[PDB]
Amino acid sequence: AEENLKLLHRLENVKPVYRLEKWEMERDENEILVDRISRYPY
Amino acid sequence: REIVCVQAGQCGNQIGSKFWEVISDEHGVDPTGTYQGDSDLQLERINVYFDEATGGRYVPRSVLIDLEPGTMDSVRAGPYGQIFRPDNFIFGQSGAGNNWAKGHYTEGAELIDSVLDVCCKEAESCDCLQGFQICHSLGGGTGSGMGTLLISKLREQYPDRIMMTFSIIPSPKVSDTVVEPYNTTLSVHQLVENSDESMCIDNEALYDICFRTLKLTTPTFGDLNHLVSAVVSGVTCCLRFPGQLNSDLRKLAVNLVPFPRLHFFMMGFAPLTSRGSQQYRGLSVPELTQQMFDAKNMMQAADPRHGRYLTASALFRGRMSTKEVDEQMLNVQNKNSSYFIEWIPNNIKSSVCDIPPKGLKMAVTFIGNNTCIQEMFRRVGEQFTLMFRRKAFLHWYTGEGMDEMEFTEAESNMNDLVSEYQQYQDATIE
Amino acid sequence: FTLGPLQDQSLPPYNDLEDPYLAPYWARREMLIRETAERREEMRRQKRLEQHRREVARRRFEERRQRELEEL
Amino acid sequence: REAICIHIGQAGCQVGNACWELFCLEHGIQPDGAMPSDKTIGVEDDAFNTFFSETGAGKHVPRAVFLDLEPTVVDEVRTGTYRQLFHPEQLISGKEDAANNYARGHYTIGKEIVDLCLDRIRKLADNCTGLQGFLVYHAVGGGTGSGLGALLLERLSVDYGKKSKLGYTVYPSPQVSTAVVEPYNSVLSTHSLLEHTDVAAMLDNEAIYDLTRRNLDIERPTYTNLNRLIGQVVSSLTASLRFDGALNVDLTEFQTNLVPYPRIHFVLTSYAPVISAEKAYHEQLSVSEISNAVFEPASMMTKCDPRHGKYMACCLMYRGDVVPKDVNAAVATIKTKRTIQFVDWSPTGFKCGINYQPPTVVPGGDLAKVQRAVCMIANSTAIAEVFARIDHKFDLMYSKRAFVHWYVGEGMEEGEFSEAREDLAALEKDYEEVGAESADMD
Numbered sequence: 001a002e003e004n005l006k007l008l009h010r011l012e013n014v015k016p017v018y019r020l021e022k023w024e025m026e027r028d029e030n031e032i033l034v035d036r037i038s039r040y041p042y
Numbered sequence: 043r044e045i046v047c048v049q050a051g052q053c054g055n056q057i058g059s060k061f062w063e064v065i066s067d068e069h070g071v072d073p074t075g076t077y078q079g080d081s082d083l084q085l086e087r088i089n090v091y092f093d094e095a096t097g098g099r100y101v102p103r104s105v106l107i108d109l110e111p112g113t114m115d116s117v118r119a120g121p122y123g124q125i126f127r128p129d130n131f132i133f134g135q136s137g138a139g140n141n142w143a144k145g146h147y148t149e150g151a152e153l154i155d156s157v158l159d160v161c162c163k164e165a166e167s168c169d170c171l172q173g174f175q176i177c178h179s180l181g182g183g184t185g186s187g188m189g190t191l192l193i194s195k196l197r198e199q200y201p202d203r204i205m206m207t208f209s210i211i212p213s214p215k216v217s218d219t220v221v222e223p224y225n226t227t228l229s230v231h232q233l234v235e236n237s238d239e240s241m242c243i244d245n246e247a248l249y250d251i252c253f254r255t256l257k258l259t260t261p262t263f264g265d266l267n268h269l270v271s272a273v274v275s276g277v278t279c280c281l282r283f284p285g286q287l288n289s290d291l292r293k294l295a296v297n298l299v300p301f302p303r304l305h306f307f308m309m310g311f312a313p314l315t316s317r318g319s320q321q322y323r324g325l326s327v328p329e330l331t332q333q334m335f336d337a338k339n340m341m342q343a344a345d346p347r348h349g350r351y352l353t354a355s356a357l358f359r360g361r362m363s364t365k366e367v368d369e370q371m372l373n374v375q376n377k378n379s380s381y382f383i384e385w386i387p388n389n390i391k392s393s394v395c396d397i398p399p400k401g402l403k404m405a406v407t408f409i410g411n412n413t414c415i416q417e418m419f420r421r422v423g424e425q426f427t428l429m430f431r432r433k434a435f436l437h438w439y440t441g442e443g444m445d446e447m448e449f450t451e452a453e454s455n456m457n458d459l460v461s462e463y464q465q466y467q468d469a470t471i472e
Numbered sequence: 473f474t475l476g477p478l479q480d481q482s483l484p485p486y487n488d489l490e491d492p493y494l495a496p497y498w499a500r501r502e503m504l505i506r507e508t509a510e511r512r513e514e515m516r517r518q519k520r521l522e523q524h525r526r527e528v529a530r531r532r533f534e535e536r537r538q539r540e541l542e543e544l
Numbered sequence: 545r546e547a548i549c550i551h552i553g554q555a556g557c558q559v560g561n562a563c564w565e566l567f568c569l570e571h572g573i574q575p576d577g578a579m580p581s582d583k584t585i586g587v588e589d590d591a592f593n594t595f596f597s598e599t600g601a602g603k604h605v606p607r608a609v610f611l612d613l614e615p616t617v618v619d620e621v622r623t624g625t626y627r628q629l630f631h632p633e634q635l636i637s638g639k640e641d642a643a644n645n646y647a648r649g650h651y652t653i654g655k656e657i658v659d660l661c662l663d664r665i666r667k668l669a670d671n672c673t674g675l676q677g678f679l680v681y682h683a684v685g686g687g688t689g690s691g692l693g694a695l696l697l698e699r700l701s702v703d704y705g706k707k708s709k710l711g712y713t714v715y716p717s718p719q720v721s722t723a724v725v726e727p728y729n730s731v732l733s734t735h736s737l738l739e740h741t742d743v744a745a746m747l748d749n750e751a752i753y754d755l756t757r758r759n760l761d762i763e764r765p766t767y768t769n770l771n772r773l774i775g776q777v778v779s780s781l782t783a784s785l786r787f788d789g790a791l792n793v794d795l796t797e798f799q800t801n802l803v804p805y806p807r808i809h810f811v812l813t814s815y816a817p818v819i820s821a822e823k824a825y826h827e828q829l830s831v832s833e834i835s836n837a838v839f840e841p842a843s844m845m846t847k848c849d850p851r852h853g854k855y856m857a858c859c860l861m862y863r864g865d866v867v868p869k870d871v872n873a874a875v876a877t878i879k880t881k882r883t884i885q886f887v888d889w890s891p892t893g894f895k896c897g898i899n900y901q902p903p904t905v906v907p908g909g910d911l912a913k914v915q916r917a918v919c920m921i922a923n924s925t926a927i928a929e930v931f932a933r934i935d936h937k938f939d940l941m942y943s944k945r946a947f948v949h950w951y952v953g954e955g956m957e958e959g960e961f962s963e964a965r966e967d968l969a970a971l972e973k974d975y976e977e978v979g980a981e982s983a984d985m986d
């Protein structure tokens with residue numbers, strides 16, 4: 001019983017690989033990068 | 043993948059004669075040993091049970107052991123007796139006396155070495171050895187004691203192979219011997235440690251099969267031994283014929299045994315029907331499936347409706363569709379869901395083989411792991427405790443040399459086996 | 473213990489809504505919708521605080537630069 | 545140009561028999577490896593070369609290996625009708641099976657046989673000049689298919705590296721079942737298969753049984769029917785390398801177009817003109833009708849319902865008499881439908897292929913003869929439902945260590961169960977996260 005509880009606690013806390021937030025921050029950094037490098041308003 | 047068979051005692055030698063007759067018939071071997079079959083499918087796996095002797099002959103890989111030669115003279119006098127190799131008959135000069143201690147300690151240790159030499163000579167000749175198969179009664183004297191002694195020695199010498207046993211156990215109503223509880227208890231104690239898979243048969247179930255299903259007016263031991271030889275020869279069919287979904291003894295063990303002590307199984311064979319009725323009903327997968335789960339066709343006195351199935355296996359022989367098998371096993375699991383252990387998502391394994399037994403279009407053999415087997419052991423333990431409290435016949439065993447501590451150990455081990463089955467019967471998800 | 477009639481021996485069609493082994497999946501989706509909403513709220517809060525810290529740093533830089541210019 | 549096929553265990557060898565029967569009959573190679581005396585004349589051709597090599601005396605021999613631990617199925621191929629077609633070295637057989645134990649195949653028994661397999665694959669790869677991938681057929685439900693397939697794919701992935709490996713895999717059906725230990729073997733196989741496969745196609749026997757009951761009129765089907773349908777699918781996918789067409793599709797294009805992220809490589813498969821000979825002559829079978837057919841879940845060869853998820857990419861292969869304008873009209877009509885939905889980050893969802901060779905008819909077959917067919921392999925989030933039921937069955941069984949003593953005795957650490965279960969939990973979370981709408985960020 002105690003081993004099963006430990007494994008369940010471990011399993012409920014697993015982390016995925018891809019994130020919406022990571023893509024979102026990289027996008028809103030690339031946004032200002034593109035605006036800086038562009039020579040016509042964007 | 044070669045099997046070595048061992049037949050011990052009167053019951054074992056008698057069942058063995060019919061088994062080797064059935065196997066010789068399906069592969070078309072004459073009682074002189076000559077192959078006379080009519081298809082290459084018969085020859086391509088003859089090695090599995092027969093070794094080839096010079097100029098055509100085949101010899102069966104079996105060891106015969108007994109303490110009095112009366113049975114061996116009877117089997118040598120039988121219609122197929124000549125096929126057996128003369129050097130494979132091992133016998134002593136005095137009987138077991140229905141006593142476990144004599145068979146295990148006094149004449150057992152005297153003869154056992156010659157049996158181990160014969161078993162090693164037979165095993166080392168195979169190019170690849172599969173498990174051993176043993177037939178014996180647990181209620182007798184030389185069968186229980188010397189069979190379990192030899193099983194322990196073979197498990198020491200070949201621990202990586204499979205150990206399979208077919209065993210006859212005393213009926214609760216039809217006793218043939220007064221001291222059956224001692225011999226049965228000590229043998230079950232030895233088997234639960236040594237065995238990998240054990241099948242149990244009640245003579246009462248074979249009588250009920252004959253009277254109710256076959257309506258035989260005057261059955262004889264030849265009929266009971268034919269039913270047993272049929273089921274014994276059926277489990278190995280996928281090892282020795284082609285099929286759409288091959289299976290093997292190790293694969294059966296892996297799918298049937300959830301925990302190592304839970305290796306006691308129920309047996310059944312489906313196409314049983316009286317000679318008058320057979321003209322009225324054709325063979326089909328629904329009819330075989332309906333008979334296969336009917337307790338009337340199951341070979342022990344305990345009834346499945348009082349227990350739950352942990353696992354089951356079905357081996358089908360014949361030209362037939364896989365869809366009907368899959369949908370039948372799903373339908374039986376869905377409609378009777380209360381009789382299947384809920385923490386296993388699928389309890390039935392299926393297997394399909396192209397070649398049916400001779401004279402039948404199709405057949406299936408059923409192996410079942412059901413908790414109702416606990417009822418047999420409880421009955422043996424009650425009769426043992428009634429006899430043991432009063433030292434009813436103990437002086438025979440103590441005079442041979444047994445310490446009383448073995449009886450208390452064997453009783454405790456059987457009680458724990460019954461408890462473990464009872465706990466899994468009443469387990470829940472929570 | 474009955475196998476039932478022959479006409480009802482066929483394959484039942486698969487319906488994953490009534491599959492007993494997929495209920496945690498549907499429960500997870502029903503939780504996931506609200507989890508996504510609260511994640512969006514947290515994200516906008518973090519963006520606002522990042523803007524605030526950037527503004528404060530800009531003010532500090534302007535003060536330092538004007539002090540460094542006036543010393544000449 | 546060339547492709548090598550690897551067949552593992554019972555399902556893989558039996559499906560191989562149907563596949564090689566079809567490839568022989570479509571090219572015209574006799575069962576003894578030769579061709580008729582009048583088929584040599586004509587224009588100089590080599591299309592068979594993708595699957596056969598000639599010695600110079602005109603015998604053909606195939607670029608395949610058959611792997612099994614039990615002899616029976618390979619002895620049946622060795623003693624059957626195609627005895628002279630295969631090279632005896634190609635048929636490799638061990639002594640005893642893996643007994644439904646993944647641990648027995650991977651640790652104890654496959655380690656002795658694996659070096660012969662690698663030596664044979666090396667001997668094949670040395671006799672090629674344009675190898676473009678490995679095709680693998682196996683079942684993940686059995687012991688040797690899972691264990692030896694994983695071990696061999698790991699070794700191939702180290703030795704050959706970047707070369708692509710495409711798998712056709714038979715997964716455990718959602719309610720039809722054959723063995724008790726299927727969840728453990730499927731989870732442990734999938735853990736190794738995640739790292740070492742580029743696209744994995746999933747098949748379930750329950751779907752092909754449903755398809756054979758509804759479209760064909762067969763009340764009692766057997767594995768030869770399912771294997772012939774699988775052979776037709778493989779022939780449709782590989783036809784793009786072998787015959788002329790308007791829009792060809794190289795084997796690298798499937799991997800490039802269907803996989804958006806490196807772990808999201810499991811695809812659904814379906815086939816359109818499954819029809820009987822008696823029904824085929826009363827109805828027309830136009831492009832739009834079979835295109836409409838490929839999207840109903842009753843047409844699929846895997847038991848999943850795509851209406852509970854979103855498609856990310858589809859690859860449609862047309863073979864036979866089809867004109868591109870009809871394909872464009874059909875795809876635009878599908879795109880109009882409201883029960884077909886694509887993830888909003890994949891606006892351009894389709895890849896098309898068009899080949900002129902119509903499908904071949906096999907003498908004992910049950911399909912009718914038809915002038916055109918379409919086959920689809922597609923990536924969809926509905927597949928996450930397939931893993932969740934196996935994972936639930938694993939959790940139910942593992943809570944009581946129901947069979948673990950076999951695996952630990954045969955050589956495996958108990959830790960391997962927890963690692964695989966955690967990796968499949970992360971794969972389920974990946975499919976949950978990828979399916980989240982990008983809209984409403986403000």
Ligand SMILES: Nc1nc2c(ncn2[C@@H]2O[C@H](COP(=O)(O)OP(=O)(O)OP(=O)(O)O)[C@@H](O)[C@H]2O)c(=O)[nH]1
Binds near residue numbers: 286613614683685767
């Ligand atoms: N479609 C299809 N499925 C098959 C075929 N043969 C077996 N299967 C399925 O695959 C699973 C059994 O896997 P096997 O190939 O027998 O396992 P194995 O590779 O032999 O592994 P071992 O038993 O350890 O030797 C079951 O689900 C069968 O229904 C086949 O020819 N076609």
Ligand SMILES: Nc1nc2c(ncn2[C@@H]2O[C@H](COP(=O)(O)OP(=O)(O)O)[C@@H](O)[C@H]2O)c(=O)[nH]1
Binds near residue numbers: 051053056183185
């Ligand atoms: N089914 C069956 N039971 C038998 C046969 N012969 C003996 N038995 C039973 O086995 C028990 C006797 O055991 P036995 O073989 O004599 O033991 P042994 O003296 O150690 O060989 C009794 O219950 C008999 O009824 C037989 O041919 N078939």
Ligand SMILES: [Mg+2]
Binds near residue numbers: 288554
């Ligand atoms: Mg196998």
